Symmetry: C6
Subunit: 202 residues, 6 copies
């Protein structure tokens, strides 16, 4: 990553490397993996981002879908930012330089610490996150339409399932509630907060 000493390059830590590999191993593509990715890659260069993605051993279908989204984003970058070199001067990054496949670490550092910065790390991160969100959505196993409260399922447990599903996938809460709770919730009227719904079906 690049952090403050000046803005300097630091090696990615074993701690970070291991945190990410273990998140992926334990959580696969549950939606909460994405903010963890984002936070573990704070200050990442593109080289660091590729490290993190490359150190994942399974899920190679997902990793190939990700390469696809990256190549689409990189093609769109190049459409909007065609590149035209001057000895000792900073060249303009192309999509593949942002994605770290045709740029050196030194180039990456030169862009990211330029004044003003060309934040290649943050641009690449957004393309990766875009890819990862597609993957989360792909691997979401259940439609929110199939999350319905069981006859002895506590409302709270049902709400947990409901919003967990909506998170991966992205009135009905009441519609999908069991008969007894639905009756209570209908009687609460419109404008009830979630808190008030949950208290009423407790």
């Amino acid at each position: 990553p690049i952090v403050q000493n000046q803005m300097v390059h630091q090696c990615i830590s074993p701690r970070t490397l291991n945190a990410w590999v273990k998140v992926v191993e334990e959580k696969a593509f549950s939606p909460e993996v994405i903010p963890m990715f984002s936070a573990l890659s704070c200050g990442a260069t593109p080289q660091d981002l590729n490290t993190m993605l490359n150190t994942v051993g399974g899920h190679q279908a997902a990793m190939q879908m990700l390469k696809e989204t990256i190549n689409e984003e990189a093609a769109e970058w190049d459409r909007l930012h065609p590149v035209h070199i001057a000895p000792g001067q900073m060249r303009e990054p192309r999509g593949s330089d942002i994605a770290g496949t045709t740029s050196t670490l030194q180039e990456q550092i030169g862009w990211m610490t330029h004044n003003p910065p060309i934040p290649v790390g943050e641009i690449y991160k957004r393309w990766i996150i875009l890819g990862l969100n597609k993957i989360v959505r792909m691997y979401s196993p259940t439609s929110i339409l199939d999350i319905r409260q069981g006859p002895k399922e506590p409302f709270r447990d049902y709400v947990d399932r409901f919003y967990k599903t909506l998170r991966a996938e992205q009135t009905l809460l009441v519609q999908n509630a069991n008969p007894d709770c639905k009756t209570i919730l209908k009687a609460l009227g419109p404008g009830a907060t979630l808190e008030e719904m949950m208290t009423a079906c407790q």
Copy 2:
């Protein structure tokens, strides 16, 4: 977070990230989670606070109740602090900027390290804590009225249950004691400290 070097931004550490996720996994919304949240988010920016909340994988009913409390606090902020920009100048934060959904990290840093500081991290933290306290109270499973000393339950064990319940929920200690201990405690008279009660029913 922002800490002293100057007040500088530092990446959230894997240690912190993992500590918080593991607290939530092991303790759910026992009341002791709140001071742990507070201490793990020392110096947090709003971006860091969202990271911590976003990395929680379960409990999405609670996470949605929290969003509600945040949006109420943010609406009250905006009622009290309407915003009116000057090139290169610091804009005034709105509720959604404090909550980190419409402000950049750079803006956040600019507010929090301003002289005088606009402590958006601490303001957001208070809204989050307000939400989390509601959640603790919601998930408290037992009324203090139902904590009563068993006939062979050691007084100390009963007192532990009593104050654990009162903590989640927020004379009777004596009223709820078993017959034998209640007699002893009545004889102690008013003004007995807890220490003296516990020694008397040992």
Copy 3:
């Protein structure tokens, strides 16, 4: 805590937070918990001390006895140090400011780094330790009078039990020894060191 860079404030570390919670979980109020508390709270502000106490999830009988001892110490402080403010000047701490319930972190820092310092962290720590020692003594399960050497119990094992009990609770060693060892120890005469006693009953 406040440590040297100047004396600066630093966030409490996840390491410290977790160490303390795990000590309490594994050791409850064995006497060795107290020096561990003391060492983990090195440089603590009152806010940090409250963090550490607040992050404990069980033992709420003990935590309430502790609040009592704190309020007594704070009432005695106020009796000895009544407080009489000048714009931009440092106010004098009251008991509740020392205990961190009515003082801000900034006030705490201002007292503790004043020249000369008003060491609110160290004063509060002593009140806490006073409370914790009462708790250790309360939860000590056995009178030293009931620690007696078993007929086949190795002397060393008996001495361990004896001094472990005396530590929680706070001639007889010989009196409480078994017949065979007592005879040997009586023959050693007065002035024997513990080492010499232990060697004689080996």
Copy 4:
């Protein structure tokens, strides 16, 4: 490694040492070991690279194949960069100096921090990585031609196996799919992305 303070030498950390040994123990020569090697050896001197390789206890067939590839790369270096010393001056590195077998740590440091640098650490790392890629390929147990979708195997599971194999080893995806999915995929037409294939056989 050499990192920024100046570019200074730092001892390899126990954390790094243990991370690498544990990667190798758990993952052997799965392809994801290589980027982990690369990232754990960030800033490595040749001495550090030899440390990391030497601390591996098993896999000595692989370690000897690696020595072979290193000696070939070192022989090619010497062919392209023959060496011709001046008291107190920096000598030119030979292959065996790059590989750290005939150079001291001090020499290594002198090359790597020279202006301009003679990046012996990065040159050696590339030879090692070249060797490790041969080893990954050797130990790849399955031809991509033998990865075929089972009749009840979910497409996603089959794609994972397919790209995992291709990664170790380095139209057919459709050819190797089961009859039912192959029919769907043929109907999608050419130019389908992987995402669209995976959605169609879901």
Copy 5:
């Protein structure tokens, strides 16, 4: 401890605290605990040394024997260094100040960072180590005279037991060897190294 920034005081780390408690829990008073104690207390003040000793929960017979040895060493210090104060000046340490029971942390720091230093931490450490060596010797369960090679016990295993015993306790190696190995060893003649003995009875 006191370490270099100036010589400054630093809080004892949770890492150190936990390392020591775990050594004692796992190893009791095997002789190898002593060098670990020494290395974990590098730069320790007397306050730190007391912390480390006080955080041990079991072994209170040993801890009381240690207090005895400390009080003897402290009495001998006072015999050799009687103390005779000048406002704002450094007083001379007595035994009990060296052992940290009557000296403050500030006094300790003032002695240890004086020019020239009065190394109270190192003096106390030597008294502690003296005590701990007595304890190691006390708890050594076996005389070296009872370590004899079994008829099918590998020589190496026997030598391990022999020198392990001698270490706790502090020609015969040959005398205590089994008949077959003793014959071989007698034939080797005098002046054989241990290496040569071990090779001969392999």
Copy 6:
């Protein structure tokens, strides 16, 4: 160790201490322990080297063989570097000073940070490593002549055993291969690389 701030002394870390003790516990004197020793003792003083050796609890036969090799190396040092003191001047180290048994930490530091340095830490380390290599060789359980490929043993598994043995101990690879693989390997002709042998007997 001594590392860069100036070259300053730093305490050995609990991390290092524990890493070494655990390596020895898990790996005994497999050859890979030696490079781990070397890397964990980077910058070690002789005092640190003795710490590391002294903290090992088992293997006291090996530890005594090591003392022997050290005393031989130290006797050879003294033969080549006899010592002839000037108030406030640096004395010349004898073998026993290099091995840290008759030199103080301060002396050690004075030698190692002298300009030019008298690298007592590196000299002692080489004597230790010399000893440890003898120990590795002693405890190597099998002659390379007894490593022969089983009739259903995969060639790769056999090569692993072969080079693992050669490493502890320090044409035949083909001679010791099973009949079927030996035939293939004979047909490959001379000059085959290990890679080509392994591919041919796959």
